[PDB]
Amino acid sequence: SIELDDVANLMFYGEGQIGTNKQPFMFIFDTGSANLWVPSVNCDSIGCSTKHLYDASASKSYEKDGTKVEISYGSGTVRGYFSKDVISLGDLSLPYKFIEVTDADDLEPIYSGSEFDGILGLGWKDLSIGSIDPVVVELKKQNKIDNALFTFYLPVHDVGYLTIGGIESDFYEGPLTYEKLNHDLYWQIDLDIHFGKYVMQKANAVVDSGTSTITAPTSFLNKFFRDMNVIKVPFLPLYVTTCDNDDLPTLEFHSRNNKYTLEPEFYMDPLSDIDPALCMLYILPVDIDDNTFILGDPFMRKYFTVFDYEKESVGFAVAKN
């Protein structure tokens, strides 16, 4: 169980350590990614000047690889070379192949603006660059945890928990309902998505602890946001509406067996640094393809979540507290 800092309901990171000298880093634990990377002491990028860095020469368990490698995200690209060392997470440890990031200039509105050091991917092997086995999968094979599964509990603002290996029943109320993945790549399930009256049937729903908002395709969201008198502030991913809006629907998510719903409180919040009568919609257009939605943090802040590699599925339940 790993404690997660919450920053404005948009970002969550917790502690991890690399190496013999227990070098601490803050990691976005990221179910939409499948590589661990940390900024190197050889990272010259401005983003890196405020981060905790990794010194291989300090760790006696460090093993050299040095193969060059790149990871792209929706928010930018990092670049470095592979290295091998022992990664610790809570009281769990394993050797792991990870990225010493050297150039983080391409992540660089976000990286210098945020307080995270690196990303720790919690996706499947096939999503990863270099075909690396996931931490939780490996941990189970080494018999360091009871089951190859992990759990996210995110709050609403004043901590959250990544929990590896077992299900803690205190995190939720009522029944836990699992959903088979349509592919073992992202944590991705089939769903009929309703945004009010606009429906896309059997969409590709991607459960991602590393995405701050709900996401739909641009085409589908032009439709929805048009008739919702919102406004985009020119040229940043900020859609604003009045905080007292009666028309904002509870979004719906149907599976072959289960209905999930997301109320407006979970997908919007006030601009408390600007005008608090105006409200910011945690819904962004992101085009992956014709039918992919990211069920990001808004979803997860309502719904306690279980990612189970043994079942190849995601378990959802209404979070407690």
Binding site: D30, T31, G32, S72
Partner: peptide, 6 residues
Amino acid sequence: XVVXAX
């Protein structure tokens, strides 16, 4: 904010 891989 943040959208996390390609």
